[PDB]
Amino acid sequence: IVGGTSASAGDFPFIVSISRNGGPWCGGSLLNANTVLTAAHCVSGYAQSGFQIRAGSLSRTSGGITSSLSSVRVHPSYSGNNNDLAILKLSTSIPSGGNIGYARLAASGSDPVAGSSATVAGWGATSEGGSSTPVNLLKVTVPIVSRATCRAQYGTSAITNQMFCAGVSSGGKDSCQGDSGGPIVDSSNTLIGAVSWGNGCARPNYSGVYASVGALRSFIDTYA
């Protein structure tokens, strides 16, 4: 997260950190006791055994409940940067209550509205190309960017309606490497997307791109 602040305890009760090879890698969202939603590019084709999930902690290294993966399901049509979602099944259940909760998904057929305020969270880099990786969770609030502007930035071929964009026109606030797969929520804390891709991080005129929960409910609801 670039341009962010420290998350408070209980801000994203459903957020999980995903380590790979015992080191930081991605984020995700707990959908229910045995299911995580993350980005396809976090897991697609990688050895599933390298991954561990941690829930119920602001820290990605300490506290909460951990689980290995029992299975990985990438969106059947994951193609390029498009349809960038995967469903992970956990071999250790993660009960809700106390400090853990499950995500509330955006309505089917919904698209985040340009100009509305969204919040993204994760343990990724704090600058483009950054070497340090936060141990405790960060968050940042950015406006949704109209898909037309996003297409102006990336080219019409690069942005689909399975994606949406968010960021500030002068730059400086964004998700970044190691945030992939983690949640972006609307001002009510409804899960609208997963961190997906971008040209760099926090560049003026290159918005962060997110996999759209509203557009992909059919995949999520079938395997969750």
From Swiss-Prot:
Cell compartments where the protein resides: Secreted
A GO BP entry: proteolysis
InterPro entries documented for this protein: Peptidase_S1, Peptidase_S1_PA, Peptidase_S1_PA_chymotrypsin, Peptidase_S1A, Trypsin_dom, TRYPSIN_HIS, TRYPSIN_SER
Transmembrane feature ranges: none
Recorded catalytic activity of this chain's protein: Preferential cleavage: Arg-|-Xaa, Lys-|-Xaa
Site residues by UniProt (Required for specificity): D174
Domain Peptidase S1 per the UniProt entry, residue ranges: 1-224
Keywords: Disulfide bond, Hydrolase, Protease, Secreted, Serine protease, Signal, Zymogen
Family named by the database record: Belongs to the peptidase S1 family.
Protein name, per record: Trypsin
Organism this protein belongs to: Fusarium oxysporum (Fusarium vascular wilt)
